[PDB]
Structures are given as C-alpha cells and as structure tokens.
Structure 1
C-alpha cells in the first residue's frame, strides 16, 4: 500500500504530532498517568535491587564459580541488542533511502538511547567493585597503568561509550528542527525559551538544511558500520573466549542479526500501542508494520541459520567438547531453554512469511512478544549453558538465578519505561520534519507518477 495515508497537510502533521507534547501538564491523559505510575514503581524496584547489589555485593545473584556471567550479562546483551534495530531505522534506512523510516526513527532513536541507558549500567553493575569502573577507561593516573586493550571488555567500554554518544548525537540533530517547531507553538512564554535553546534557534533554511541532510546522511554513514561493530564486540566478549559454545566464528553477524531481531520485536511491542492509543494511524500505516515484520523475518531466518551453524559446528567437528555442548543443550539439565529457543525463535517465525499473519495486529504483537522472550532464551543458551559444562567435569555446576537477578531485570524494565514515558511526554515521538518532507515526497511522486 502507501506508507502515508492521504488527507494530510503540513499543518495537519504539525498539529497531530506537535500537540502530543506541549499539552498542559495537568491536562495529561490518565492512561499515561497509569503507565508512568507502573514505571515509577518498577524503577523503585530497580533502586532497591541496585542498593542491595551495592551493599551486599554481586553474590546476591545466582552466579557461582563456573558461571561467572549469569543473568546479568544475559540482560546486558539483550538490552544492548535491543538498540540495533532502533539504530537500523535511525541510520541504515536513512542510508538505503527507505520510505518507512520517516515516522519511526524518532521512536527508534529514543528506545535505542533508553536501551543503551539500561544496558550500560550492567557493565558497571556486574563488577562487584563498581566504583572502579573508570579503570577500564584509559585515564591519567599516578599509577601509570593502562587498560589491557586486547580484552573484549576493554573493547566494550569504548564500544558502549561511542555507541551511546553517537546515538545521543543522532537524537539531538534529529531533534533540533522538531525543537524549532515545538518552540514556535508552545504558547507558554518560559517553555518557548526551553525549546528555544534546545533548538538553538534552528532557523529552518537552505544553507542550513543542506548541512542538515549532509550531516545526517553522513552520520548515518558513520553509525551504520558502528552499531554492527558494537554488537559484534558484544558478540566478541564471548567469541574471543576459549569456551566451546563461545568460540564460534559465526558469532558477530549472528549476534548482529539477533540484535536486529529482538530490537524489531521491541519496536513492534512498543509501537503498536503508540499507533493505536495516540492517533497516529495515518503516519504509521499498516504497510509500515508489514515491512517491519518482513525485516524481522529476514533477521529471524539469519538467526535460525546461526542455530544451524551451531548444530553443524557441533556435529561436523570430531571434538568431544562441541558434541557434549550439543548434547547438554539438547538433553542436559538446562536443556529447557534450548527447546524453548527452537520453539520460540524458530517455529514461531515461519508464521511471518504470510501476509495475513503480518497484517493481523494481535498475532503480530504476540509473535513479537515470543521473539523477545526467545531472544532472551538465545542469550541464556549462549552464555549460561556453555558456562555450566566445561572442559573439566569437576568444574561442572548448575546455574540457578536468585530473586535479585529477576528483580534487577524488572527494575531495568522500569528504567526503560520511565525514560520512554518522559520522552513521549515532553518531546514528540514522530519526526515532524521528515514527515512533512515525506508528505512532500509522496505528493511529488503523486505529481510525476
């Protein structure tokens, strides 16, 4: 169909998108109030879990001596991997000249930043001496020491910091002209200065828009290899390690695909309510959700191919350790997660080949929810199960999470949803410009036919 529904003018774009922010704060809808109250409650669960993590130590988690990376690193890889599809809409679709990114890239960039804020606490939080996190950063000290810089956590620190800063930069340049519109309609005098210095007095103009498209296309060209590498490096903190299930050569493209897959699941699960509850049906059409299910289907096939590559690596090899990896994943004590992985991330994705399954909104929402849960299960199968059973059978032990792993997970959900709710309150969730430009491009296609 069409990515934008008709009956829309530039006044209508600015009215519909711009008036979801700059509403009076006492006129704020009660559904937003309920969601933000739930997010505030879960953020207090976060603060309690982080407090007991800091006081007692990292031993409140279920980690033991074989599994040094339990549920904390799993949630780290899941939360960082959610950001790939948001950056995909942000940068890669900007590079590929894709017409469906024009209504999504604001929400995509926003949840990339919020998943980055949720992920980036986990390298600090999983230390157990977290106040020395700056030792992984090359800083001038009186000691004269350095980070090792050949470790993959040493790559992780640069990687998450650069990724956080570039995604913040892309958000700010993507937000400057929408700041310029929201300053121009705010109707309260003090709020006009607040969105004014946010816009920097953007002054939407040629010789300013030239540098706008030029820098945005070029930053998309910078961030497009960057998010692939940053999730390759999140892969590489297993892929350089000598554990049998972790030293797999397919891991950087397979973790990149799993990241886009889980992130597209999350963008589904958090934009079907944004499409329905906030009346943005014309801006986010059904063809939008069709093409997003198609891209999720692509990455799901590449992830299922990665599972096949793991099965082929374990069967083709004559090593005992890869074969016992496949046995303990298939018939071991933690084999439930691997069976739920092939039920979730493999069986439930074959529905998305058919158009009516893609166009059905409840089916699409529930299948995206299974994608997110089974993606988490894939991180569990990669990390925990391979750390359970290793080279020496004396160093074999089961991993059981405590209440504090789940407490921190639910609390990071609270931090994510809280930051998302402030985002959808003060700032607009659809790019006002680049939808007006998309309106221009749509009526120009309707002109030249």
Structure 2
C-alpha cells in the first residue's frame, strides 16, 4: 500500500521486537573493555576537550571576563555567538523529538533519542555561557526571583531575564521529556541486562515501569502533551534568545523578523548537527537497519525547509534595512557586504544560501558524503550568522567614535573548542550508558509495519 511504502523505507529488511532491542541492547550492555574502540579514544579526546573547558573557565573566573578580547562597542563576542549557536543546535533535537510527535510522523522514531539527547548536551554547553559571560558569575542567582532580604528582584523587561527563564525551562523540560522517553527503554535495558548492579542501575532509572496497559495510556498523553509543550517552548526559547537582540535599538539587531528567523536558524543549524552526529552513529555503530537513508533524506528536507526561511531572513534583513530610510541601517548593508568583516557576510551567504541549496536535489541528500559536507557548511555557516548578527552589527553602529573590532582572544577559542569537549563528554557517555536510539518507539513502526503488511 501507499502507507506501507513509506514505513518500509524507515526500517531494514526484516525486524522483530527482539531484533530492534538486541541491536540497541548491544551498543549498550556490552561489557566494559568489550566496548568498541573509537569510543574510549573518542571519549578521551572528548575528556581532554573538557579539561580545556574547565581550564578556560578557571582562567576566566580567576583573571576576569576580559581575557576574551571583547571590546566596549562589541561587549558580546564569542560568549554569545556560541551561546546562541549551541542553544540553536539544541532546537532541532526537539523538533525531531517533540514537534514531529505532533505530526505523528515515524521518521522521528529512530532519530528520536540521538536528537533529544543531542538537545540536552547542546544546552549543557549553551546554558553555561549566560552563566559565565557575566562579568561577576557568582552573582548569577540575582537573575532568579527569590525573597532575598533586600527588596531587589530581577527586572522582567530584558531578554537576559527571559533567557534564564527560557534556558532553565528548556533545560528542565527537554530533560524530563527525554527522561520520559527513557523509562520504557531503561525497562528494556533492565530486563535484558543479566548483570546485577547493571540491572539495578537501569532498574532504578526506569523507576517501576512495568509496561502496563494503563501505564502506557498515561505515557501516551504525557508524551503528547510534553511534545505539545516543547513545540511552543523551542519556538519561544530561540525566540526569547532572539529577543536579546531585537529589543535593542541597534540597527542590525532591531530587525523585527528575528523570532521566526532565529527559530528557523536554530532548526537549520540543529539538523546540521543531527546529521553530523548520525552519519557516524549509523556507520560506526551498526545501526543501518534502524537509521535508514530515508531518515537523512527527510532530515535534509526539513533542514532545507528551515534553511530557506533563513535564506529569507537574510533578505528580510537586507531589504527592510534598505526599505528603512535610516542612515544607520543603510550603513548596515554597506557594513556587511563591504567593510572590515565583509567576508563574514560572504562566508555566510556562501555557506547558507549558496552551498546548502544542494539539499534541493535528492542526488545531494541521499548521498551522505554530501549531506555531511552540507551539514559542516551549515554549522560553520550558522555560526557566521550569529557572528554577523552580534559582532558585525555591534562593532560599527551609531556614534562612529565607538567602532571596535573584536579579534577574539585565545580564551574564546579555548572555551568554544573546549565546549565541544563538554558536548562529546556527555554524548559519548549517553551512547555507552543509555540506548542511543529509542527502543519502544522502534518496537512501534515495526508493529506498525506488520500491521500494514497484514492487509496487503
């Protein structure tokens, strides 16, 4: 049937419930020192990247926030370009896990946890920059509302006060919706462990899951509503992060279309990171029977449906800069196209509007070497968008006597390139400790493929 021809393109040749469990119950529950190579010599490169993270933080806390090369015109440099970037990555991990659950689509089941757990670790590296770019990080509890023996409360008019309410909600909701999606799987890992103190570990995480006829109905409504709550959440988290630029009167920042273009940029850069992390998980970890090439064909289309709202945002920011008869937004066009950071706006149009237009053609989407090259070109390209928006619009603004440059210091590089350590330290821990791909959601779409094969 026409419905079976799209289900059979997401799974391998033949799969049963104990086969989809064994395929994921062998990437986990394999013994330590039987764990595959490339993980420990990938977890060490990730741990050495974490020692660069905790040392670029210990140098930042001790010496100051001014080891970053941030000037006074451009006080927001890599610390916020990488905050909006890292949180932008995490938004298309929930568009897979939560927004696609609204559309009841099934190409999300295999890429569910490898993107939902990708969100959290892209928030654990994005939730640190608003806690560390402050000059006095120890007083970051002042951005929280609490009766604190001095009548001051946070402002609730600035988007850095909505950030600590978006990032903290995005954290403790994409964690709970991720931990919700694990209690059935951690019950599969517990029942299949055959190792005391390993069965107890997953038996403690999967609280009492039990399966259950009614426990599954309460799950299907808790997972649907959480998916229906993480759809306006991530539509607002990178819209609130969008508003720490759009509530400022700066020329390149007060662009009103930032909310539906930062969200479109977060889904754009996020699917690039999902593809960058699944082509290795599909190749190295033998998950060819679960993460089929139709998942990348569709991720390349959703990464295209978002990349055209970004490539539209580059025009709704150029046109309405010109359409605004301001001297200061006319200059915005003649400061990005020309100017000292002209190459930033041209290593951006090339990397978001020229190179990733190949996602239109199935020749450049099914072919994973191109989808992996376009995803590299988007993650770098969507970093330059966050550099064009922040630094290229700050360093040349009103009052020409306040024009800086922001050459980033070594402690911006040794913190951003070390942030990938804290991302892969957790992402390699998640692969080894937890199922790197949903089990019951892949038990379904196997029960759904046999249910459709039953009629035909």
TM-score (norm 1): 0.99
Q: Distance in 2 between matches of 1:305 and 1:78?
A: 19
Correspondence 1:179 to 2:186: yes
Q: Distance in 2 between matches of 1:44 and 1:283?
A: 35
Aligned to 1:138: 145
Aligned to 2:342: 335
Q: How far did residue 362 of structure 1 move? A: 0.7
Q: Secondary structure at the match of 1:296?
A: helix
Correspondence 1:26 to 2:33: yes
Aligned to 2:301: 294
Equivalenced residue count is: 449
Match of 1:438 among 421, 440, 445: 445
Deviation string 1:222-252 (CA, Å, 9 cap, x unpaired) is 1111110111000000010110100011000
Q: How far did residue 363 of structure 1 move? A: 1.0
Instruction: Say which structure is richer in helix.
Output: 1
RMSD: 0.8
Aligned to 2:71: 64
Map 1:95-114; keep pairs closer than 5 Å.
95-114=102-121
Correspondence 1:161 to 2:171: no
Q: Distance in 2 between matches of 1:199 and 1:314?
A: 53
Aligned to 2:232: 225
Aligned to 2:360: 353
Q: Distance in 2 between matches of 1:74 and 1:347?
A: 22
Map 1:234-383; keep pairs closer than 5 Å.
234-383=241-390
Q: How far did residue 47 of structure 1 move? A: 1.3
Q: Secondary structure at the match of 1:30?
A: coil
Correspondence 1:409 to 2:416: yes
Q: Distance in 1 between matches of 2:404 and 2:19?
A: 61
Q: Distance in 2 between matches of 1:394 and 1:326?
A: 19
Aligned to 1:147: 154
Q: Distance in 2 between matches of 1:11 and 1:194?
A: 21
TM-score (norm 2): 0.97
Q: How far did residue 431 of structure 1 move? A: 0.6
Q: Secondary structure at the match of 1:145?
A: coil
Q: How far did residue 263 of structure 1 move? A: 0.3
Deviation string 1:260-313 (CA, Å, 9 cap, x unpaired) is 000000000000000011111110111111011010011111100000001101
Q: How far did residue 315 of structure 1 move? A: 1.6
Q: How far did residue 6 of structure 1 move? A: 2.3
Q: Distance in 2 between matches of 1:357 and 1:412?
A: 30
Q: How far did residue 139 of structure 1 move? A: 1.4
Question: For structure 2, which runs of at least 5 residues remain unmatched after alignment?
Answer: 1-5
Q: Distance in 2 between matches of 1:97 and 1:134?
A: 39
Contact 2:90 2:122 survives alignment (8 Å):
yes
Match of 2:89 among 82, 90, 95: 82
Aligned to 2:3: none
Q: How far did residue 188 of structure 1 move? A: 1.2
Q: Distance in 2 between matches of 1:107 and 1:342?
A: 29
Aligned to 2:391: 384
Contact 2:90 2:120 survives alignment (8 Å):
yes
Post-superposition, which runs of at least 4 consecutive aligned residues in structure 1 deviate over 6 A?
Answer: none
Question: For structure 1, which runs of at least 5 residues remain unmatched after alignment?
Answer: none
Aligned to 1:14: 21
Q: How far did residue 448 of structure 1 move? A: 2.6
Q: Distance in 2 between matches of 1:163 and 1:352?
A: 29
Q: Distance in 2 between matches of 1:133 and 1:62?
A: 22
Deviation string 1:140-196 (CA, Å, 9 cap, x unpaired) is 211121000111111111110011000010011100011101111111111111111
Q: Distance in 2 between matches of 1:306 and 1:57?
A: 36
